Every structure is written in structure tokens, then in C-alpha cells.
Amino acid sequence: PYFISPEQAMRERSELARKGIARAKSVVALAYAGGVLFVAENPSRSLQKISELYDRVGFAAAGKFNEFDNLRRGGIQFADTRGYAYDRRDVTGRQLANVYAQTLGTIFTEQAKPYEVELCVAEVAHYGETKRPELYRITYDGSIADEPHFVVMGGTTEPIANALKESYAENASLTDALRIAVAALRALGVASLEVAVLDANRPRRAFRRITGSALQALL
Amino acid sequence: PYFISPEQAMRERSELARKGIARAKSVVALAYAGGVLFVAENPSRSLQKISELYDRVGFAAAGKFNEFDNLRRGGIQFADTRGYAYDRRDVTGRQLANVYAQTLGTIFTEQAKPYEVELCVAEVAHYGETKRPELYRITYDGSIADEPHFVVMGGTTEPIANALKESYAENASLTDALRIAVAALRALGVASLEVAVLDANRPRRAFRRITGSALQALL
Amino acid sequence: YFISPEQAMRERSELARKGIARAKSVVALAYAGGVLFVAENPSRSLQKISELYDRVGFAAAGKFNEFDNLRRGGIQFADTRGYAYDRRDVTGRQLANVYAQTLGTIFTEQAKPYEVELCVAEVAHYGETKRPELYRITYDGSIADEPHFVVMGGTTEPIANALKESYAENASLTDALRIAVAALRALGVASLEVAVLDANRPRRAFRRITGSALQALL
Amino acid sequence: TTIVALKYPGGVVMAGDRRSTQGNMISGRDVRKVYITDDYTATGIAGTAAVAVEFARLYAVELEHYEKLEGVPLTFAGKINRLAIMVRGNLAAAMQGLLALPLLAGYDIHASDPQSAGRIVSFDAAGGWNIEEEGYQAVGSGSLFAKSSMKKLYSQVTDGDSGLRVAVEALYDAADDDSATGGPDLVRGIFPTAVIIDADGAVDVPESRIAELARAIIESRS
Amino acid sequence: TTIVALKYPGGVVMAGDRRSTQGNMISGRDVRKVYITDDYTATGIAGTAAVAVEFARLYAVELEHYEKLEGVPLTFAGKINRLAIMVRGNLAAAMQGLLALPLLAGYDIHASDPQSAGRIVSFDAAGGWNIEEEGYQAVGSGSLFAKSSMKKLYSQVTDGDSGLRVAVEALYDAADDDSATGGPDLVRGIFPTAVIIDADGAVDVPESRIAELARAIIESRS
Amino acid sequence: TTIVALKYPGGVVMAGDRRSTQGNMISGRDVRKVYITDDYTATGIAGTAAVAVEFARLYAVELEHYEKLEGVPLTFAGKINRLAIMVRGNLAAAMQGLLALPLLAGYDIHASDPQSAGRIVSFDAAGGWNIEEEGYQAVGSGSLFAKSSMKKLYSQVTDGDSGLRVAVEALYDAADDDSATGGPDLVRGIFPTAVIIDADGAVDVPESRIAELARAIIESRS
Amino acid sequence: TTIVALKYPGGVVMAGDRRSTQGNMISGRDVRKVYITDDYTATGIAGTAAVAVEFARLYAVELEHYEKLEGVPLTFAGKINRLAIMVRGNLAAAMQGLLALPLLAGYDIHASDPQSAGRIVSFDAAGGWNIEEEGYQAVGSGSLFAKSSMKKLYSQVTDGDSGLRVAVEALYDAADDDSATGGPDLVRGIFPTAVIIDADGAVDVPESRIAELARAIIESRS
Known part of the structure; x- marks a missing residue:
């Protein structure tokens, strides 16, 4: 009836x-030797676009903060x-990736405005086990894609995705993967960078932020 | 307008x-000596389009993953x-085939967007009994069709359906039916193939995936 | 606007x-032993003729899921x-009535009308004499009392006329089957759904006639 | 209270006394306990007076209501069932003391043999019912004396009138051996009430006939 | 009350007495306690008469209802399950005194060996059931005497008729040692009721056959 | 009732007797109390027969349901948890008398050392559970005698077969000192049931093996 | 059961025994009653075993949940409050017998003086709590003997290790005068469990250290 x-x-x-997706800060997530690395272009010190979801499951997003933030909370719940x-x-990155997609599709169909968000759910193996990092990208409609190496979200994704395509190296150390990720992200300054890792070597909680002086020393 | x-x-x-139905990966299901064979063109390793429903009842689908996946869950329930x-x-392939059709029709009439899905429900006989495999195809509107030999779902169905029309042979072994199904599906590579059977010879749970090295040896 | x-x-x-027009044709007619349903049905699982109660039978033509759904409601x-x-106490009349009212209300409040045509049949009980009753219920809720035969679905004119010439009251089961198949053609042993409301049965009158016996009869 | 019912060739008869008590105190000398619920059934109810009159009224309403909706009376089986369901519904209150037991007499028009189309049906407090087949039934505090009287007097029943006399006598013996059952009051002229059902329906026996039968019995015993 | 059931080569037989009491008082001389719930199962119910007849009726309705919806009867296992669920549902009322216990006899058409397709199933008040495998079962106040009789008489069972005679005798001994179970009434001509199930379905044994067997037993004991 | 379970190098064994009583009366001579809930767990349940069989059935359903939804069985820890939650749910009815206690034996495929991947888990009426580490457990009226037998016999356990013999013997002593536990019936040929779980899954011990072990024990004691 | 906790300069120590009984019967020889709920708090729970383990688990979950949502742990005051609210919630079941009492030890990182940042908190069944300031606390059936032991031994506490020895000794006296508290089992090698919290977080004392302290005490008393 319209x-x-x-x-x-x-x-x-x-x-x-x-x-909505296009006019936003860019985030990248890539696999490296010790797990997965999230590097986002973020000026604020309070508002964050990278988050722990569960013991070994991390989360990055790009779009409208209140909405992606809201999904963050739902996923934690x-x-x-x-x-x-x-x-x-028993909680796996796969189940979580799935929940967001279904919710997004239903929500979009029944709501007024679609969530101008792009999500990346990451998972690493547990302590003392061998398994490849898994990256999933969930788009605004509910589509979900399985990524083997890296995900780029928000803004203009083509140049960053290509620079990563040339620079990516499996089993790169933490410093090399950080250089590659910041370089491809530029396609910046020590300030306004949000960097975190899913360190596969931690016993339980794998998510760990890399901020301040240590980050400066690394870069 | 109004x-x-x-x-x-x-x-x-x-x-x-x-x-929606047209722009999708193709799936085939055909009867062979040991039961029913599902062969789908599937690149992902996590997302699947073939599933056990009950002891002797299998299920294949083609369309939008979240929706066909959702029906998968409803049917299992x-x-x-x-x-x-x-x-x-007491649970039979017929009752299940029926439920999906009614649900789909009602859902389409009362919902916003129709499910861009195509379903195939398969059933074989129990252990130590003789009966012909039954294939049903349920379309997006609720229509249900009884197929004697094979079902083709998703993508361009004409060339695959015709190639199967020439190559099909009742009581073909597992290897021959696999060759026929992959050949008619091409109208591919060892990777990105989802193959499962409803083996009528199993005592209870008939569904059984055929993956990896064994599949490579067979092909 | x-x-x-x-x-x-x-x-x-x-x-x-x-919707009613593009469908398989069904006929129901009175004969000596009760009422005869003969439908053109290719599938072996999907049926358009059904027992409703001890002496009340049911045939339909249209969209299977809907007519099937009414079938279930009527059984309930x-x-x-x-x-x-x-x-x-349950009679063919009460059932015929329920479907019509439901259909009318449903059509008025729903989105799409049920593209169905129904025929409810009733015969007398054991050891009693009474004429078979046929009712036809159409998609809107209209109900019509038929003395001899009902034709549903597809092109009803030629079948209805052929039956008009061939019908004979108190025809045996074989003659009524020949008349019904002949007027239905206006076919092959396969894809035929045939059942009777045999007035001679003690309780449950509905009885399917399938396979070899049917072949012998025809 | 005491209500007897007996079949005779070609019909059924149902009679009831008139007393209603509270403890040892005689409170009603002319209660009517047998109703004509419809053209072919009469219903007697023993027990709490309120629950009794209510049962009778509501059951009559329901029989006639279905008759108006469907254009045909229920079969005797359906009637039996509805009465049974009412009785089962009063069970909670019957445990609390408000017990009411019905005895249902009817003439089945659909039965095969007209001479045995009479029907007597008895109920317990739990709604179960039983179709009596030894020819007679009774309910109430005097029921045992009434039944033991009819067992002996029943070979005398040959028609409507002899059956009526046997009914009145059975009541007389109930009252003779139980104090809660009133006998024929010759002083005030109050006699049991009776209903006769046969092929032509249900009619109340006019009082004079019951008066004569009662006087005949009373003179026979002197 | 007492209801016996025993398998014989090729079938099953199920018989029940006719008395119904209230305390010491004999209230029903011709109750039928064994029903044919369907073409291959008969059901006896001991216990409260109301709850019993209701169970039987409703269970028959449910079996036949699923049969009409799905176009095929349940397996004997499904039937067992539904009966068990009904019985479990009456448990609250059974603690309040309205207890009803069913004994279910059936002939499995799907069993492998036809000579042992007979089936006897017993239930407790809590809905648990047990598939009897020593060849016979019974329920009711006389059940212990009936079982102890069949244990000795059971080697005589070789066909449908000998199995029927053994059933009637077991009932006779139940009644002989318990007062709540009625024996064959030679005066009024009322005998136990019996149902036979074999490959061809369930049929009621006509009364004459039971009459002859009962008279043979009674003359044997004199 | 009595159900023993003991680990042996490389696996676990779980055996249960066959009797079921009502008071002093022996009502079932061949009940099966040990189920194979899945390819790596068996479950015994002591207590009310209804609640027991229901627990076993429903738990098996739930394990397999999650397995079908997620494509991988729960870990042994998750299984323990779900069983515990069921048991905790029956607590209200267990205070009313319907108590059922499960003993859960499993073989952890994910454990580090295969020779000690066996697992025995015991529950109380309040849902708390305990992972047994002294090598054996039992439940039921004979459990104390069974445990006190296994404490002495357990140094003899060296493989699957010796562990099986020790299980059967423990059952024999339970039955020997408690009347609610049935021993091997040599007359009818009914022996305890046993399940063996090792690296290759769970299989029922065929009856002949249990028969031979039981006869060896019985001749040893004479 | 008995769980002691005592502050020492620079930290807190918390130890608990291992026995779990049912009446006079020793049912568990190796239960762990002291959990590390978070990096700066350990929680002991005396009382019903189920309710105890559940409390500990759920409280740990809640502390960590708020920490993940807000990005900062609660203050020691907030933690005290949440634990108190849980305890108050179990009050209805504690009157029914399912009582569980927690003793909470923590190291406040925000306190002013590091040498006295240790914290001990005790709860009653009604959720009220109290911040202990005489240096030690205990809970369980042996708590009175443990406290009366620590009152005398507490002047010896000067560091982490002496505080640990005093804890183990207090437990030894609890067990020495109460039968529901288990002492060090030298035969099976099972010793009390202990947790130490200081500026660097919470760590479990490895078993060897507790073994040596226990052997020193036992030889001192001989």
C-alpha cells in the first residue's frame, strides 16, 4: 500500500x-603470526570502534556510532x-557472525532506516591449539562473507584493499603487520589511532589494546 | 501514487x-542405487546448502542463505x-515437504519480501526395506512438485536439467551418479563442491557427507 | 489518487x-450404492477426495494447499x-453450511480469495432409505443443492452436458464409472482418483477404488 | 423424598411424593418434584431443593434450545448425555452438601418396538448413568423401600392404569417406612404427583385419579 | 472387577466379568468392561466406572482421529504411548480416589512372526507400562486369583478356543475367591464378555459360546 | 536396584541388575536400567521407574538435538551440566516421592591420555554432581554393598574383560545382601545388563558373556 | 566445613578444608571451597554444596560482566554490595535448609596505604555484611575453634608466609575439635587449599607449600 x-x-x-557507509573512518583487520590485528582511524579518545566480544572473539565496525555501538552491546549480551x-x-565467532546478519536483515525489513554499518567479527584459536584466524564481514543487508586474510571497512575501501593486497604476508610479525596496516590505511600520525590485537598466545581473554608509549615505540 | x-x-x-532465484549457485539431487545424491556448487567451507532433516529425510536449497538457512532450522525443529x-x-518426507509449502505461502502473503528460495526435500526407505527414493521441490510461492528422478535448483536450470535428462540412469552406482551430476552441473574443480548422500544402507541416520580425500579419490 | x-x-x-478455471476436473454423481467421486489426478500422494465423517464425503478443485486446508478444518x-x-448428529448439511460462512467471512477480511470449489456429499445410514445429497459451495460462500451430479474445476460445460445425456438414476457402480469417465474426457487407467460413499457399509461409508480392481472394473 | 418410575407395556410412568423437610421439621406439604422437561421426557430430582429445581429448569431450557437451533430434538442418547454432564458439573457442590440426583424417564419415538420404547435412566453423584432394564427405578431416602415394594408388585403391571396404581403403592410403602417421605394426606387432600408418557407425549395425571387410587390402597390396608 | 487377557498361538483373547458394586451392595449385573477400541486393539479398564468408560471412549476417538488425519494407523508402540499419557494424566484424580487402570490387548500386524504377534500391555497409576512376556495378564480386585489360576492352566492353551476356555475359568476362580467379582449367573443368564483378536481383526465372542464354556466349568466342579 | 560403573585402563564399564519391585512384591524380572544415551556416554538411573525411563529418553534427545544443530557434540562438561539441570528440575517431585538419580559414564575423546579418558559422574537429588576419582561408583539400594565389594576387588581390574567380571561380581554381592536387587536368575536365564565404552564408542555386552561370568562366580562361591 | 581468612602486612590469605559430608558419612575428600572470583578477590562459601558452587560461579560472572561493559572493575564497595544482594536473594531457600554463607577476601588497589589494603568481609543469611577489622575471619561449622585459634596465633603473622602457616594451623585446630572438618590427610596426600592476594593479584598456593606447612604442624604436636 504505497x-x-x-x-x-x-x-x-x-x-x-x-x-552512509562511504562517509566514514576506515578500519582494517588482518591476520598475523600472533592472531588478528585491528587498526582503525579514530580521533576521539572515548568513542571506540574495536571491542572484545568474548574470550577469543573480537569485533570491529564502521558507520554510525550509536548503531554499530548498539550492535556491539547486543553481541556482548x-x-x-x-x-x-x-x-x-561453545561460543564461536561463527555463531555470533550469524546472529548479527539475521538480526540486521529482519530489522531492516521491518524498521524505518537501515543501519548504516559494516561489521567484522574475528576469531582466533584457544590457548595451546593450532587453527587459522577467521574473519567474517557482515554488511548492512545481512550478507556475510568469509575472509581469509584481511577485511577493510568504511570509507573508500578500494585503495586500502589494494595496498593490503600487495603488502600482505602471512605470518608477519606484530610490527610488520602494523606497518603494513597503517601504510595501506594511509592510501598517519601517532595520535588518533585505535589499535588492538586478538593475541592467540593469551591464556583466556585474547583481546588486548595497544595504546600510548608502547605503540609509539612500535611505530 | 496511491x-x-x-x-x-x-x-x-x-x-x-x-x-533472486536466478542469480544463485546451482544444486542437483538425483536418485541412485544406494539412495539420493546431493551435489551443490559451494565455494565456502562454513556455509552449507545441504542438510540432514531427520533420520531418512534430507534437504537442499538454493537462494538467499539466511532465509533458506532459516527454513532449514524451522524444518529441523x-x-x-x-x-x-x-x-x-512417523515423520516422513511428505509431511515436511507439505509444511514448508504452507508456511511459505502464508508468509509471502502476509510479509514484506518473498523468500527468494527454492527447496528440495528428499526421502529414502528405512533399513531392510524396499521403496523408491522420493524427491519433492517446493518453490517460493508454496507450489510443490513430485519428482521421480532428479531436481535441479537455482541459477540457470535448463542446461543442467537437459544434460541430466540425457545422462541419467536408474540404479547408477555412487561414482557414476557423481560423474553425471558434476558433468551436468558444469553445463568443476575438486575444491568448492558440497557433496552428501542419503545412503539407504545406513541403519538409522542416512545422511552422510562426502568430503576431502575420499571425494578426490572418487573423482 | x-x-x-x-x-x-x-x-x-x-x-x-x-483460478477456478485452470484446474483438474472432478465429478460426483449419485448411483445405486451411494455417491461416486471421479477426479482427474496424476499425483499418487496429493488427493482431491476425502472422507469427512462416517457418511459424509468431500471433493474439491482449485489450489491444493487451500482446498486441502479446508479439508482439515472440516475434519476438525x-x-x-x-x-x-x-x-x-453430524450431517452433510451442517458441514456444507460451515464452509460457506467461513469462506465468505474469510474472503471479506483476507487478502486473496480461496480459488477453490467444494462439493460435500452425504448418503443415508445403514439399513435406512434416503436419497444421496450433493451440495456445491463456491468461492464466495454460495451453496447449491444438486439432485444428480456436481462438476467442479476446469471447463465444466462439456462435462456437465455429457453427464446430462448419460446420467441414469440407480445406475450400477460400473455404469456410473463409465458415464463419469466418459463425460470427464469431454482417460488412461493411470492418474485417476476414484472413491465411493458406499451406502451399504455399516459405519464408515467412504472407500477408495484403486489399482488392479479399478483396472478390472474399467 | 422418593421418586419412582416404571415402564409398562407401551409407556412409562413417573411419580413423586410432596414433602420437604429441614431436619425433623416438615417444611413443605405440596412441593412438586416431577417436571415435564419435554414432550417425551419427564425428570424427577431428589436432594437439595434449590439445586433440584434449578437442574430441572436449566435442562429443559437446553433441550428446547438445541431443538430450536437444529430443527430436530436430540436423540434419547444425546439427552442422557447432557443431563449426565450437568450432574457431573454439580459434583464439587455435592461434596459440599448441595447434592441433587436426577431420574430420567422418556419415551423413545425412534425405538424399533413401540411396546418397549419406554426408557428409565438413573444417575449417581459423579455423572455416570445407567439404563435400567429390570423395569423400574427409584431415587431418594425412601428409594430402597420403594424398589423392594415394586419388585413384588411388578408382575401386576399390564397397562397404563395398573402401572400407575403400582407406582402409587410403592410410594405409600416408602412413606410407610421412612419419615422424610410424605404419604397421601387425606385431611388436606394432597396426593403424589404423576406423569405418564406414551406414544402421544407426556401428560400430567389429573389429581382425582391419584386420589382414588390412594383411597383404594388405604382402605385395602385397614 | 477382574479382566484377564492371554495370548494364544496366532492371537489374543480378553475377557471381563459383569458386576459393579458400591461398598457391599451389588449395583450393576451386566456392565461391559471390555471395549473394541479399534480393528486390532481391545481395552479393558478396572476401577472407577465413570473414569473407565470415559478413558475407553476418548482413547478410541484419538486412535481413529490420527488414523483419519495421516491415512495410516499408529504403530502398536504409538498406541501404547498415547494410552500411557492418558493414564499419567489421570494421576491427580487417582490420588483423590478416581483411579482407573487399563489393560491393553492388541495384534501387531507389523510383527515378524504371525504366531507371536499377540501383545499384552499393563499400566500402573503413574502411567508407566510394561509389555507382558509370560503370556497372560489381569487387572482388578480379583487379578491375583486370576493370575494364579492362569499360571497353572496356561499349558492347556493351544488355539483360540482353548485359550477362551482358560480365560473363562480364570474369571470363575477370581469370582470364586473374591466377592467384588461376579461369576456366571445361571439364573439370569449373564456371562462374562470376551473379545478375540487375530490376523483378521477384533470380534466379540457371541454370548452362546461363553454360556457353554461356563456351564462346562460349573458342571466340572460339582 | 543397583547400578555399578568402573573405569579400566582404556575404557569404562557400566552394569545394572533387572528387578523392579512394589513393596515386597517382585514386579519386573527383566527391566533394562542402563541406556546408551550416545556414542560415548551411557546412563544408568535408579529410583522411580517412570521418572527414570523418561530422564534417559529426554536426555538422549537433547544431546543429539544440540549435536544436529551445531554440527559437533557437546564436551563432556556440557553433557554433565545438562544432566545436572534435568536432575535439579525433578527436585520438587523427588520430595513428593518421585526421586530418580542418574549415574553417568562416558569416554572423553578430547582427554589428553587415552588410558585415563574414562569418566564416571554421580549426582544427588539436588542436581549437584561429582567427578569420581577413586575408580568406581554405584547407585541404588544395593550401592553400599556394591561399593564395599569393588573396593576390595578393584586391584584385579586390568582390562575390559577383568573390569566386566568385577562389575558382575559387585552386582552379585549387592543382590546377596539386599532383597530389592535381583541376582542372576539361572532358571529363567536373565542376567545383568552391561555396556562397555572405549575409544571406539559404546556397545552392549552380548548376553552370553555375562552368562558365563555369572556362572563362574556362582560356581566359585559354592 | 571451615574457611579462614586473615590479613597480613601487604596482603590477604584465604584457606579452606576439603571434606564434605552427609550426616555422619564422609562423602567428598577433595572438594575445593575457595575460588578466585577475580584478579583481586577470592570467595569462600560454607553451607549447602550446590548453592555454594552456584553462588561462586554466578558472582564471578557478574563481576566480569560489568567489567566488560564499563571498561573498569567495580570498586570493592560495589563488589561487596552485589555479593550481599545475591546472599539476600537466597534467604527464602536458606530458611528451607539450602543456606550458603560467603566470606569475601579482596585486595583494594585504590586504598591509600598498600600495607593495609587487605580486606575481609563477612555475611549473614540475611545479606547484611560487616567489614572485619580485628584482622581475621572464618565461616563454617569449625569457625569458632578457628577464630579462637587465630586470636592467639595472630601476633606471629608478619608476612605472606607466616600468615599462610597461621591459616593452616587454624584449620588444623578446627578439624581437631570438629568432625565435619577434615584435617590434612597424610595417607592420601590431600591438604587444605589456599589463595594469596597481594598487590600483584590472586594466585593459588601450590600444593607442596601447604604440604610442608601441614607436616611441620603435625610433627610439632607429636
């Missing part, structure tokens, strides 16, 4: 979502209850 | 659904409760 | 008519009613 062709309206919605019901090692 | 021709909106919806109330041998 | 309601109603009626109402009062 005038403007529904298909046309859907196309307009997609265009609006694309525009689901994991704790699930773990309490069954156990910590 | 007052429009329903018959036009409905036609547009059908066209949209058709387009119904069978377990029904079995617990009455018994395992 | 608004359109109209009467025009919309006319469009709905036309759509319903089209009879059992509960019988349990509350008794088996001999």
Missing part, C-alpha cells in the same frame, strides 16, 4: 545505505548468556 | 522472486518435536 | 474465476461435534 514503486524505494534505500547456559568454549 | 493494480504489484513480486510426541518412523 | 471498491470487487471475482469440526453430542 505510491513510489516498492522496487524503486528499495533501490533508493540501498543507495542511501551505501552513502548474547555471548554471556549462551556461555552461562552451556560453556565458554 | 490506488494501483494489485495484479501488477503481484506480477512485480513474482518477477523479483524469479530474479518440527521433526524433533513430532517424533518425540509420536515416533521417529 | 484513489480508485474504487466495486471495480476492485469485480477484479477479485475475475481473478477467482480464472465434525470430530469435536460428534464427541460433544453424537456421530449421527
